[PDB]
Structures are given as structure tokens and as C-alpha cells.
């Protein structure tokens, strides 16, 4: 078994960092002057957790980790080859380059799910 550790694959190649995806999710939750400090932090924890979980829910995924969708890769989103990415780059690098167009993709991945559900049922 390969267990580099929490965030241990932040500097490894993105393909190699796909191998460790359960460790980061595990420790994300980690379930009177000091009291207000501690409590405030402990609320922002569950809020930061439930925002990303909410998104992962309304994209139809709901299922933890890698999830596919039928959205086409608009090549203008940093056009490189696949071997040019998953054998080379790291996730910080990657999300930096994609950071510009990220929000648009989050918006698109919203709407397509819904129609699927709707007419899927019916």
C-alpha cells in the first residue's frame, strides 16, 4: 500500500496525485476568550465542507472522488495534450492555469445536470 500522507501528493504529478485522493478528503473534516475562537473555527469548518459537498451534490455526482460528466473540453482552457498534463503537471500548477475559466465551468456543470434528471425520469 502507498500512503505518502495528507497533501503528500501536492507536488507530485497529477496522475500520481490521483493515487492519493482518500487521505485529503478524510482529514478535511477531522471530526471564555479561547472559546469563541475555537467555536468560530469549528463552524467555518463544516461550512467550507458543506459548500463543496453541496456543489458535488448538484452536479449529479454525489459520489466521492473522481466523477465524469458529458461537458466538452473547450480547448481554449489551456490547450495541452493529455500526456502533456497527466504525466507532467502538478495540481497547484494546474488549478492556477485553469483558475481563470474555472467559474464558467462550474456554471455549465450546473445546468446540464438538471435537464438530464428531468427527462431521464420521464
Amino acid at each position, epitope marked *: 500500500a502507498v500512503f505518502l500522507g495528507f497533501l503528500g501528493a501536492a507536488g507530485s*504529478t497529477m496522475g*500520481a496525485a490521483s493515487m492519493t485522493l482518500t487521505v485529503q478528503a478524510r482529514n478535511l473534516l477531522s471530526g471564555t476568550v479561547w472559546g469563541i475562537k475555537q467555536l468560530q473555527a469549528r463552524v467555518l469548518a463544516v461550512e467550507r465542507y458543506l459548500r463543496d459537498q453541496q456543489l458535488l451534490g448538484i452536479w449529479g455526482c454525489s459520489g466521492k472522488l473522481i466523477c465524469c460528466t458529458n461537458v466538452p473540453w473547450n480547448s481554449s482552457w489551456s490547450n495541452r495534450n493529455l*500526456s*502533456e498534463i497527466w*504525466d*507532467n503537471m502538478t495540481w*497547484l*500548477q494546474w488549478d492556477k492555469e485553469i483558475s481563470n475559466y474555472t467559474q464558467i465551468i462550474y456554471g455549465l456543470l450546473e445546468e446540464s445536470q438538471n435537464q438530464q434528471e428531468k427527462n431521464e425520469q420521464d
Partner: nanobody, 131 residues
């Protein structure tokens, strides 16, 4: 997207101090490998060896198995991704068939079955083996 610097070299007799250096810019110096190749007018383009700056693994050709030594230096960062290092090579047993320009060229990407294939090349340092 950065250019690799190659160090020009002295004419040399069949015995004299021999080394050529190579500098870097604009890339993460410890991911990509380092390949060395030498083009003479008598035997064509010949691959010599390669070495990784992160691990240090050199694989040489049997034609340079006992007369060439390769070296890498330590990385000096600039930003969170880019960096600046260097690497030398000392080819001993200077024969006359070694006369001719030669080069440095780093690997293409960090992982795969084609980790080290030389994508980014240098400028060119020229030898003249001559008494």
C-alpha cells in the same frame, strides 16, 4: 518555455582539463531529466547518457561507460514552480574522433514511458581536439 544555457569549450590536446557546463532557466529543474548528445562528422549523432537531478540516476552508453563522468548541481529557486540549476560533464580519454560540437538537452515531462526524451535543447558548445 525557458532556454537552457550551454558553456563554450576550449580547444584541447589529447591530454588537458576537460569539462563543459550547462545552465537552466524557466523550469522546475528536478522534474525533467538531463540527456547529453554529441555530433561528430565521422560517426553521426550519438547519445551519451542521461541523469535525473532529483534522484541522480545516470544511464550511459557503453561507448562512454568508462571515460565520461556526468554531474548535477543544486537547485536555486525563483518562484513556486520555476528554478535555476546547472550540470557539468567531464569526458576523459580525449581522442581525435571526439572533435565536433556537442550538446545538452533535458527531458520532456516528469512521468510515463517517455519521461526523459529530450524536448528542450541548448545552444551548442564546440570542441576541437587538436595538438
Amino acid at each position: 518555455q525557458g532556454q537552457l544555457v550551454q558553456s563554450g569549450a576550449e580547444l584541447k590536446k589529447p591530454g588537458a582539463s576537460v569539462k563543459i557546463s550547462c545552465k537552466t532557466s524557466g523550469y522546475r529543474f528536478n522534474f525533467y531529466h538531463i540527456n547529453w548528445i554529441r555530433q561528430t562528422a565521422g560517426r553521426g549523432p550519438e547519445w551519451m547518457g542521461w541523469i535525473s537531478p532529483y534522484s541522480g540516476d545516470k544511464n550511459l552508453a557503453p561507448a562512454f561507460q568508462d571515460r565520461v563522468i556526468m554531474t548535477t548541481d543544486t537547485e536555486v529557486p525563483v518562484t513556486s514552480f520555476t528554478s535555476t540549476g546547472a550540470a557539468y560533464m567531464e569526458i576523459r580519454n580525449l581522442k581525435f574522433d571526439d572533435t565536433g560540437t556537442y550538446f545538452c538537452a533535458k527531458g520532456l515531462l516528469r512521468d510515463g514511458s517517455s519521461t526523459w526524451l529530450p524536448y528542450l535543447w541548448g545552444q551548442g558548445t564546440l570542441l576541437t581536439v587538436s595538438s
